[PDB]
Amino acid sequence: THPIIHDLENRYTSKKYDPSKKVSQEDLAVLLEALRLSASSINSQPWKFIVIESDAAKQRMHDSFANMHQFNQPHIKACSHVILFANKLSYTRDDYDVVLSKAVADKRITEEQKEAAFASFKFVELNCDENGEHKAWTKPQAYLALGNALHTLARLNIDSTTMEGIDPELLSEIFADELKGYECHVALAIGYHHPSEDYNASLPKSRKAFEDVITIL
Amino acid sequence: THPIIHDLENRYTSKKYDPSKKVSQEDLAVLLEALRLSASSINSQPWKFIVIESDAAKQRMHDSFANMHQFNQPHIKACSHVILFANKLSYTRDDYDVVLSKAVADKRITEEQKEAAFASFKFVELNCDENGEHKAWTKPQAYLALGNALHTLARLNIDSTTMEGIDPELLSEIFADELKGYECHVALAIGYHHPSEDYNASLPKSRKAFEDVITIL
Ligand SMILES: Cc1cc2nc3c(=O)[nH]c(=O)nc-3n(C[C@H](O)[C@H](O)[C@H](O)COP(=O)(O)O)c2cc1C
Ligand SMILES: Cc1cc2nc3c(=O)[nH]c(=O)nc-3n(C[C@H](O)[C@H](O)[C@H](O)COP(=O)(O)O)c2cc1C
Ligand SMILES: O=c1cc(O)c2ccccc2o1
Ligand SMILES: O=c1cc(O)c2ccccc2o1
């Protein structure tokens, strides 16, 4: 099988973890750097990836399922790490300056061209919603990073469970300081599936027929 | 360098294509199958990938830049193929029926279980607009597929240019029948960069400091 297809046909959504296997620091570092290298509109990187690693952090995450989507709760303490994909509520010219400044430092643009580079920010200004927030534009960038992450995990042979069945309001309360100026609509548990109780590991993958999703013109 | 990091450090946004090189059908088939295998919330697959391959289709795509984002227009005819990432405006039970029916046909589930599988559709009603549109939920799923595609292209060593600088309104007119019931906010040109005029090929990649985007708890 072609290596790319093999990876995408073999990755799946784990439904039960093995609490005695942890992701190595070597593998976790690759995943985190892969997330950092994700592409985004105008190199905005309007995101923050929060890694729930410690027992104390896991308890806090565990508690965010207090009143909603409890079918996802058992994974928190059983898996190795949980990653929160946070997207910025509003993206300002100041946030953008952080990017442009770094670009001047990395030698991709000149300080003179920097001011000239601020014109690409108009693209952000046009995507400003009712309340003056850009969350409808920043959230999709974070999902792009998530797609990158899922492909990355398939290559490292690490199991995962993407989760939209979370409580964003309660997460913003529990991780108050960390999610300041951001929102979190999706989290990702990673680890190693349970050898006998992860029933999804044995089910066939199902997707729509090629002609139902692809059109060639 | 670690294979995953090498791929992500070496892929970049091409700013000029070589019109004499096309993507092979073998490579195109891998990319399209990779898009099809993308994960999505509840396996909804609320997307359609439209491939602009023929000269006639390229002309239509070329014409969608008549009003705006002219800086992106030259790539259309120069590159090999353009892929439109379309997301569904509203996701219904009939839409989910198609997913569940294919799941049954894929032996993933049984007809009896197909009836109980619709209980997962409750999560789609949770993203219904005041207008009844789920575009704020479907668009992020399409961006996840895009993140998957960008990683896939890095593995195949094919150049690309993601494009949000497009005209969704003009696209809806030009690709009237193909996009009925969908919207398209991002397209992707693929091909091979111009050997000497693609200036971005020689510029360093720039991303925010690890500490600025990643928090470990
Ligand atoms: C954005 C997103 C959110 C999802 N949320 C959940 C979730 O809350 N719980 C879980 O069990 N699975 C969740 N999934 C898993 C999907 O059901 C799964 O990706 C889809 O059925 C395709 O199956 P595979 O992932 O097994 O290929 C989610 C997936 C995506 C991409
Ligand atoms: C969603 C999205 C839309 C983008 N739109 C454009 C576009 O219209 N034109 C183009 O030249 N670059 C576009 N880019 C490219 C980004 O500027 C580029 O990904 C970011 O600067 C990081 O650089 P790299 O992609 O070279 O790593 C887009 C990227 C993303 C992910
Ligand atoms: O030069 C660019 C680069 C971008 O990332 C971009 C994004 C959205 C709109 C237009 C754009 O123009
Ligand atoms: O069983 C599932 C599968 C999903 O993909 C999902 C998505 C969002 C909310 C809850 C969910 O529960």
From Swiss-Prot, chains A, B:
Pfam families: Nitroreductase
Cofactors named for this entry: FMN
Keyword field contains Repressor: no
Gene3D superfamilies: NADH Oxidase (3.40.109.10)
Domain of life: Bacteria
UniProt function note: Involved in bioluminescence. It is a good supplier of reduced flavin mononucleotide (FMNH2) to the bioluminescence reaction. Major FMN reductase. It is capable of using both NADH and NADPH as electron donors. As electron acceptor, FMN is the most effective, FAD is considerably effective, and riboflavin is the least effective.
Summary of subunit composition and partner proteins: Homodimer.
Protein name in UniProt: Major NAD(P)H-flavin oxidoreductase
